């Protein structure tokens, strides 16, 4: 049973879905379950009581949204089962889980219990013929067509940098933080309350993400932007009430570089990139500096790559060619590589079959991934 396999690119922010051997994912929607706050007195209302995908995006105001995954670690397992069921259902894929093999994704250095419980869901509740779990960095390099590359990614949950060299992922050189797009959006919300405009509800939270996506930029020199007085640019809500953002637009993404702003001493994006290259072997460093690949949504800020270059120039050894590459399709880079990996004939050997899972259990899944 070797049908056209499915590529479920997981993530706390957005969940991409579709079939193998495609250019772009057809089914992209945000990873959250929406349930109504209010009472439904009047008949002919929105049925189901559980809202996932474009219905939830359309009807935010009703729904008390709650994210099942934080930092690539599913907290609420019932909510992820409903989302994965919604992905497979007639509203998106229009196919059964029994037909196609599954390509799952996870962030590196995650809890092994979550990986086991993920496999349990796909093998038992859904009846998958074969499952395979993979990393974000390996898939990003598949999409570009390279083998050598440091993959500095920045999603909604996790930021990390896996240094791969000619098809050799070094597991001990991996640097990871739990500071990313969601924490920047949460940090922007806190600033907007200090400015004046308060947002508190979960439906109301996604307005702050939309402000962060649209009107934010990274200053090349933050001390210079502090000393100077900002212009105070405007933004229109779905309501229509105007919001003067002020200095919070440039100070919000500084959480990525200075994680001491949230009050949680970590490395930072630029330090993680340097530390990943430094932890690897001596002869591999110059090739890893030349091949720096970007991916994820929190790399899309204005002047992000310019500042990320300047920080590498400050930290790294002098007179070395730094090249921070970044494709046009950064958001779907991980899905594209999964679709390419799924289309290859070697894919049949790498996966974990249902029969192999029933015999061995979790140990066989831990062996095949690494």
């Amino acid at each position: 049973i070797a049908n056209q396999p499915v590529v479920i690119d997981n993530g706390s922010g957005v969940i991409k879905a579709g079939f193998a051997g495609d250019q772009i994912p057809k089914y992209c929607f945000p990873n959250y379950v929406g349930r109504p706050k209010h009472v439904r007195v009047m008949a002919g209302a929105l049925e189901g009581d559980i809202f996932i995908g474009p219905k939830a995006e359309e009807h935010r105001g009703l729904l008390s949204i709650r994210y099942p995954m934080e930092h690539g670690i599913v907290k609420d397992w019932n909510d992820m089962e409903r989302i994965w069921q919604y992905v497979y259902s007639k509203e998106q894929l229009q196919t059964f889980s029994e037909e196609h093999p599954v390509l799952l994704t996870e962030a590196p250095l995650n809890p092994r219990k979550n990986r086991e419980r993920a496999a349990e869901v796909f093998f038992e509740t859904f009846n998958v013929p074969a499952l395979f779990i993979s990393m974000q960095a390996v898939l990003s390099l598949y999409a570009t067509g390279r083998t050598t590359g440091v993959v500095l990614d920045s999603g909604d949950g996790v930021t990390h940098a896996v240094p791969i060299y000619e098809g050799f992922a070094m597991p001990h050189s991996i640097m990871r933080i739990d500071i990313a797009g969601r924490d920047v959006s949460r940090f922007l919300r806190l600033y907007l309350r200090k400015e004046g405009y308060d947002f508190h509800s979960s439906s109301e939270f996604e307005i702050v993400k939309a402000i962060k996506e649209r009107a934010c930029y990274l200053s090349i020199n933050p001390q210079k932007d502090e000393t100077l007085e900002t212009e105070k640019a405007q933004y229109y809500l779905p309501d229509g009430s105007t919001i003067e953002i002020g200095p919070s637009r440039f100070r919000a993404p500084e959480l990525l570089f200075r994680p001491d702003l949230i009050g949680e001493e970590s490395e930072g994006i630029h330090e993680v990139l340097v530390f990943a290259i430094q932890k690897s072997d001596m002869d591999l460093r110059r090739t890893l500096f030349s091949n720096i690949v970007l991916s994820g949504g929190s790399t899309l800020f204005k002047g992000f790559g310019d500042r990320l270059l300047s920080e590498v120039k400050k930290l790294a050894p002098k007179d070395v060619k730094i090249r921070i590459s970044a494709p046009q399709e950064r958001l779907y880079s991980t899905w594209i590589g999964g679709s390419i990996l799924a289309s290859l004939d070697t894919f049949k050997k790498m996966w974990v079959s249902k029969k192999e899972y029933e015999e061995d259990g979790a140990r066989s899944i831990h062996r095949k991934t690494f």
Binding site: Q23, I24, P25, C28, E213, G297, L300, G305, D306, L309, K313, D319, V320, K321, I322, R323, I324, S325, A326, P327, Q328, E329, R330, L331, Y332
Partner: peptide, 20 residues
């Protein structure tokens, strides 16, 4: 190509100049 989010005029990469 089709889909909601893209960036126009960032470029593929930012590279330092190669010396002799």
């Amino acid at each position: 190509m089709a889909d909601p989010k893209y960036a126009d005029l960032p470029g593929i990469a930012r590279n330092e100049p190669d010396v002799y």
